[PDB]
Amino acid sequence: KSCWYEEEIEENLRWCFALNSILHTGASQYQDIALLDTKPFGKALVLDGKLQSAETDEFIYHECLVHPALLHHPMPKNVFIMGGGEGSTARELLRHKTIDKVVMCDIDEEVVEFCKSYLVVNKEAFHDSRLEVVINDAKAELEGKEEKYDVIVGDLADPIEGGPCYKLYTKDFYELTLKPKLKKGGIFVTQAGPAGIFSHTEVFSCIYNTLRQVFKYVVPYSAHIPSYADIWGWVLASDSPLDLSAEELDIRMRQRIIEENRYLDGKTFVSSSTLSKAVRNSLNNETHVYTE
Amino acid sequence: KSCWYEEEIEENLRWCFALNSILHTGASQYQDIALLDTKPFGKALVLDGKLQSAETDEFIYHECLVHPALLHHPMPKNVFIMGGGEGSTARELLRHKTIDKVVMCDIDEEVVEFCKSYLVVNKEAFHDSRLEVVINDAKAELEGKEEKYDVIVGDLADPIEGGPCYKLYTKDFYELTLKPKLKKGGIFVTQAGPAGIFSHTEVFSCIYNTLRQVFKYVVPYSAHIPSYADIWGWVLASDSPLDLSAEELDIRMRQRIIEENRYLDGKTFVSSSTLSKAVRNSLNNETHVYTE
Amino acid sequence: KSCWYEEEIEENLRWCFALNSILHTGASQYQDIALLDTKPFGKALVLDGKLQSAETDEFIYHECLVHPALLHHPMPKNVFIMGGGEGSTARELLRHKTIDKVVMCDIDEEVVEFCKSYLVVNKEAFHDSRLEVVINDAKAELEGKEEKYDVIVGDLADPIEGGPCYKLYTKDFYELTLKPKLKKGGIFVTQAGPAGIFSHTEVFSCIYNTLRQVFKYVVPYSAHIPSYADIWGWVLASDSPLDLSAEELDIRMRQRIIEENRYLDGKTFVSSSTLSKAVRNSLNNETHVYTE
Amino acid sequence: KSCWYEEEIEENLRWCFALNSILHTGASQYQDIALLDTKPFGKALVLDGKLQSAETDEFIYHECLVHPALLHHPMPKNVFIMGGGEGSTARELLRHKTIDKVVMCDIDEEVVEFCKSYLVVNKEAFHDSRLEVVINDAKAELEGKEEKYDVIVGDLADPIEGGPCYKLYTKDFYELTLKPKLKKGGIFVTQAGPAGIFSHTEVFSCIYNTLRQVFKYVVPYSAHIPSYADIWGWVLASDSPLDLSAEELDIRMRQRIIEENRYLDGKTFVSSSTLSKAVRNSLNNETHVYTE
Ligand SMILES: Nc1ncnc2c1ncn2[C@@H]1O[C@H](CO)[C@@H](O)[C@H]1O
Ligand SMILES: Nc1ncnc2c1ncn2[C@@H]1O[C@H](CO)[C@@H](O)[C@H]1O
Ligand SMILES: Nc1ncnc2c1ncn2[C@@H]1O[C@H](CO)[C@@H](O)[C@H]1O
Ligand SMILES: Nc1ncnc2c1ncn2[C@@H]1O[C@H](CO)[C@@H](O)[C@H]1O
């Protein structure tokens, strides 16, 4: 009844969850950090007052971010995460039997240490001997090391000039920093912001067009995340083709992933990658490219 | 920043729209009626303080409810609407060159008169000489008249027991009243409530399962409606198959529908009818059947 | 900006405080108990989802309830509190050098234990050897014991019929139970509900009028409590006059009260007891008397 | 239930009124303008999203602003309002039989024209032959004309550097512009912002200390305004004494004011001008003076 967490999604639109408690908090120079216990969505990780991960449905975002990319790869062994302090991207990646090493590269040690203690769903992930945590800006980390990867995962905030993430979505970053760090058959996947019928023009279409300047094959896809009050997007990108059937995705899931996915089967992916009329038109007509 | 319409759309969950004004109110024996002018979604019809339709995205619901059914029919000429006092369903039907008669059978004359007075977008539709407005319970109307239809459209409220709508979702209604009023090769479509990852179990899987007990061919499908903050569902049912490629649907739309759809092309429908893993599972494993 | 406690303090009127956290909860046969940490008002005790006391301004209510009564008495030595489980009333009484015994008679042991555990400001007070805590309905306690008091203090909820408090505001209670338990020259004071320009008619004028039927001298007074968003009232009653200058009150405070009052000096009390035009009129013209 | 007007009083504090409607609006380069129909406070004039005047209680603000000043004057005939577009200050001034001319000088013609049509409580005031409306900055108007007044009334917004009002609260304005425009026995009164136990340090005490540098006799006073969620302040200032009894105020009200005041009698004024301990201490220790 009485305690509420409130979020301004758009200037004109508010989304409010009744609270059981405010469990813990932290803060860093990068962002405020909080963990709420919400009645409709259970525990919820909030960074800078924006909801990031809710207990009841974070599996949707993290399965969709991680699995398509790994499943389109013939044999993905080494993966780098840009972001991922929250730990659930690493969790889903470590469900893959083919994985030897995951590097999580988060800029904010405070998110890592907070989530490692308090998002206990990710506890085995954080303690898995295949995981290396690096506290750095993912752009400097990628630039200063020569190691190559089978999959690189963008789990960053949306591109906002002056914020710490924008540079990790430019054409130059993708071409001159990222692509050289992908092995043959390498696949890049990034979160790509809201992807609703109106909200898709904010960053999703630009992220798509940006990737399209750099990688030969670029597959945008999207899914509803109840707690975000919108459809969310992701984009796969590769110089090897990205075209597998629902059933081949399902066979690889069965063979390579420990436990059953809760959201994603191969049919769900094919649906996800078939965008609606207006969304396809936007992405196809998009001329804007992120630069700097 | 200061004026808000707020609705508790699930318990512990409020969804709030910035308000420009309250344009007109109304009432009937059945419900309170309001037309709000909202900032994020334009003019919004609210019945008993539940949002029904919002000017900026009602095209999504109405294109989805109408066009798949008619497009899957070889030559749909006459169509009966159960409910639909808001007028947009009729608007979308009347875009079809094949259609020579639309009956709108809504139990609430005040809703019809209100929307006729105040929904500018549906003025032409309400005054199309193909449209007959009938004020009656649709169950009674379908029983007492012998006329058959190529397409019957359910534009009613959700089935919750003791509602004025429950009886229009029962096996017996469908078997004994509705089906006998479909012509040979006739198609039924109904709105089917929330279709979100967890909300799809409230009524969508029951409505699907109930129609499965009466029609040979049943195709469920869903789409995000921004102003509802959920995915919403519809269900096609027929004793002839409902099976057309995306390319065939695009052709039929070009040949039969006046002007370009804003939401729906062929690939959009295919995608809509490819449900996600957990939703497909619920539907395929569902046992409840609506009866009284 | 994101976490809020909200209370509908009148119908159609919400008052919302930014929340830092929910510190502790509790419950009893009588009420839900919460200690919130709020931004504008510090720690806030909430009973059945109604704010009782807020750390930053409870001094106002408690100074106002306590000090005028004792200051108008020549030598107040023993005092009985009806209610007061929160502990601040007792805190303020025990500041008086004259006082040798305080009985706190609260019907809810859980409230007392909660506040003893969690209200740091009242720790010393709860452990003052002058204080006796009694767990009982104050009406029953006053009846079954023969001891008389110099001052009796009402720190109860408002009288609304069927409340556990109503009976403690009736003419008969005052006449038959309370007055017989005042020593010669004894003073009663009670909290008297809202005292705002329009809210003063709910209970303040009735409580004043009811006490007028039993005591020769009745002085009503009021002060703004920021966290209540209203003016609040109290009423002094005695069969000896209650009549002291501001200068005399300032002297008595300097000689009898340990440390400086934060809210109340002599001129503040004079001002508090000078009600506004419409409030004085209501009081002077009031006819309702609480009985059962 | 569903439509709400919301106001952030403090960063941490929200105050929300259920709405019947949004009646009219206007806007100017100076401020947004709206008239809401609220359930708890009736019609409400809101400028820049801050509530200014509510139907149920604006009489409190406007009686308190206007009457003390005029009633302490021996024979006030000519009055100048700085602000007053809303019309209620003029209304209350025109209830005085001694008044020959009222000049309302508002910077924003749009407030004047809006309120003249839509705040019909002020309609006789706006049409009274004794009222002259001037559209100007009150500082330029006062500076460029030689006419002197018996009473000058500040009905402006709070002093905020860079806003259009700050200059009308400086020492230099008061000494070199205002005082020369007051006749012998002239009295200045200004609204002086919030005056609550904590909120009084924002502008009230500074406005008091500022006036104290310029006028020999300065009387601060305050009253609760339910719709503002706080105690509001005003300050009288004169080089002739300001010291009348409750009863002399009452006799002058009876003789000179048409109709009965609803809020103010002379006792209410004496109470109003007796500030509480902490408020008096603040005002007396205040060293800050508004300059420029
Ligand atoms: N440049 C960056 N490199 C790595 N992680 C980042 C960067 N910017 C933001 N993040 C992390 O991304 C996550 C999502 O915002 C957060 O954990 C945040 O700390
Ligand atoms: N039994 C019914 N027959 C026809 N229309 C109905 C019935 N019950 C509700 N409606 C209409 O359905 C629409 C959606 O609730 C409303 O316009 C309502 O009037
Ligand atoms: N009849 C009563 N006797 C004593 N205390 C009471 C009674 N009813 C309520 N209270 C106490 O009054 C306080 C204020 O409501 C609470 O602590 C409550 O427990
Ligand atoms: N400098 C000024 N002179 C006159 N009126 C003003 C000035 N600044 C603000 N106002 C008016 O004061 C009123 C209260 O904010 C509004 O009607 C506004 O237009």
Short mmCIF file of N, CA, C and O in Angstrom, two decimals, chain C residues 81-116:
data_model
loop_
_atom_site.label_atom_id
_atom_site.label_comp_id
_atom_site.label_asym_id
_atom_site.label_seq_id
_atom_site.Cartn_x
_atom_site.Cartn_y
_atom_site.Cartn_z
N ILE C 81 0.26 8.88 32.42
CA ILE C 81 0.11 9.01 30.96
C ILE C 81 -0.86 7.96 30.50
O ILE C 81 -0.60 6.78 30.64
N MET C 82 -1.95 8.38 29.88
CA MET C 82 -2.80 7.46 29.12
C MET C 82 -2.24 7.30 27.69
O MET C 82 -2.31 8.22 26.83
N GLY C 83 -1.68 6.11 27.42
CA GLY C 83 -1.11 5.82 26.13
C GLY C 83 0.38 6.11 26.28
O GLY C 83 1.02 5.75 27.31
N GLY C 84 0.94 6.74 25.26
CA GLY C 84 2.33 7.18 25.37
C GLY C 84 3.40 6.13 25.20
O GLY C 84 4.54 6.37 25.58
N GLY C 85 3.05 4.98 24.60
CA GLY C 85 4.02 3.90 24.35
C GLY C 85 5.24 4.30 23.53
O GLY C 85 6.32 3.70 23.64
N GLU C 86 5.10 5.34 22.75
CA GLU C 86 6.17 5.87 21.96
C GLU C 86 7.33 6.40 22.83
O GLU C 86 8.51 6.37 22.41
N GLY C 87 7.03 6.85 24.06
CA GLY C 87 8.07 7.22 25.05
C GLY C 87 8.49 8.70 25.10
O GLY C 87 9.19 9.10 26.04
N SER C 88 8.01 9.56 24.16
CA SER C 88 8.52 10.92 24.14
C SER C 88 7.81 11.80 25.14
O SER C 88 8.40 12.77 25.65
N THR C 89 6.53 11.52 25.37
CA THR C 89 5.80 12.17 26.40
C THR C 89 6.51 11.96 27.74
O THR C 89 6.81 12.90 28.46
N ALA C 90 6.83 10.72 28.06
CA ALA C 90 7.57 10.43 29.29
C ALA C 90 8.91 11.19 29.27
O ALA C 90 9.25 11.85 30.25
N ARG C 91 9.62 11.15 28.14
CA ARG C 91 10.88 11.92 28.04
C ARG C 91 10.70 13.35 28.47
O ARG C 91 11.48 13.86 29.32
N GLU C 92 9.64 14.02 27.96
CA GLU C 92 9.47 15.44 28.28
C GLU C 92 9.11 15.68 29.74
O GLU C 92 9.68 16.58 30.37
N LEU C 93 8.24 14.85 30.31
CA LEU C 93 7.88 14.93 31.72
C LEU C 93 9.11 14.84 32.65
O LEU C 93 9.24 15.58 33.62
N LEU C 94 9.99 13.94 32.32
CA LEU C 94 11.13 13.60 33.17
C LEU C 94 12.21 14.66 33.17
O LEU C 94 13.17 14.60 33.96
N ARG C 95 12.08 15.62 32.24
CA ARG C 95 12.87 16.84 32.25
C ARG C 95 12.53 17.77 33.42
O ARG C 95 13.31 18.70 33.74
N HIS C 96 11.37 17.55 34.05
CA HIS C 96 10.96 18.38 35.13
C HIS C 96 11.64 17.89 36.43
O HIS C 96 11.49 16.74 36.82
N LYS C 97 12.35 18.80 37.10
CA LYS C 97 12.95 18.56 38.43
C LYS C 97 11.91 18.23 39.52
O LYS C 97 12.19 17.48 40.42
N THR C 98 10.70 18.78 39.40
CA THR C 98 9.64 18.50 40.37
C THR C 98 9.12 17.06 40.36
O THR C 98 8.52 16.64 41.33
N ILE C 99 9.31 16.32 39.26
CA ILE C 99 8.58 15.10 39.01
C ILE C 99 9.29 13.97 39.70
O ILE C 99 10.46 13.78 39.49
N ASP C 100 8.56 13.19 40.49
CA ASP C 100 9.18 12.04 41.17
C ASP C 100 8.60 10.72 40.70
O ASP C 100 9.22 9.71 40.90
N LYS C 101 7.43 10.71 40.05
CA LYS C 101 6.88 9.51 39.49
C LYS C 101 6.09 9.79 38.19
O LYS C 101 5.26 10.71 38.15
N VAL C 102 6.39 8.99 37.16
CA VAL C 102 5.65 8.92 35.90
C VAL C 102 5.16 7.47 35.65
O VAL C 102 5.99 6.53 35.47
N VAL C 103 3.84 7.29 35.59
CA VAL C 103 3.24 6.06 35.10
C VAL C 103 2.85 6.21 33.64
O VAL C 103 2.13 7.16 33.31
N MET C 104 3.35 5.32 32.76
CA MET C 104 2.92 5.21 31.35
C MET C 104 2.02 4.00 31.23
O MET C 104 2.50 2.84 31.39
N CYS C 105 0.76 4.25 30.96
CA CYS C 105 -0.23 3.16 30.84
C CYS C 105 -0.72 3.00 29.42
O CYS C 105 -1.66 3.70 29.01
N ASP C 106 -0.04 2.12 28.67
CA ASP C 106 -0.34 1.86 27.24
C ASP C 106 -0.87 0.44 27.10
O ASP C 106 -0.30 -0.49 27.65
N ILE C 107 -1.93 0.30 26.33
CA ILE C 107 -2.59 -0.98 26.14
C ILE C 107 -1.81 -1.99 25.29
O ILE C 107 -2.10 -3.20 25.30
N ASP C 108 -0.81 -1.50 24.54
CA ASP C 108 -0.07 -2.35 23.60
C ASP C 108 1.40 -2.54 23.95
O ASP C 108 2.26 -1.71 23.62
N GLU C 109 1.71 -3.68 24.56
CA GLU C 109 3.09 -3.96 24.96
C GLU C 109 4.09 -3.96 23.81
O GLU C 109 5.28 -3.58 23.97
N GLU C 110 3.64 -4.43 22.67
CA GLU C 110 4.46 -4.44 21.47
C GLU C 110 4.87 -3.07 20.99
O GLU C 110 5.99 -2.89 20.48
N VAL C 111 3.97 -2.09 21.12
CA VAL C 111 4.37 -0.73 20.77
C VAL C 111 5.46 -0.24 21.69
O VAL C 111 6.48 0.34 21.23
N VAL C 112 5.28 -0.51 22.98
CA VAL C 112 6.23 -0.06 23.99
C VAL C 112 7.56 -0.71 23.74
O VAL C 112 8.60 -0.01 23.77
N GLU C 113 7.54 -2.02 23.50
CA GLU C 113 8.81 -2.76 23.31
C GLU C 113 9.52 -2.32 22.05
O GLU C 113 10.73 -2.15 22.04
N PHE C 114 8.76 -2.11 20.99
CA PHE C 114 9.31 -1.62 19.73
C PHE C 114 9.99 -0.28 19.90
O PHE C 114 11.16 -0.13 19.50
N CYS C 115 9.27 0.69 20.48
CA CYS C 115 9.86 2.02 20.70
C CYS C 115 11.03 2.00 21.67
O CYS C 115 12.03 2.68 21.47
N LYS C 116 10.95 1.16 22.68
CA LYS C 116 12.09 0.99 23.59
C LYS C 116 13.30 0.45 22.90
O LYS C 116 14.43 0.88 23.17
#
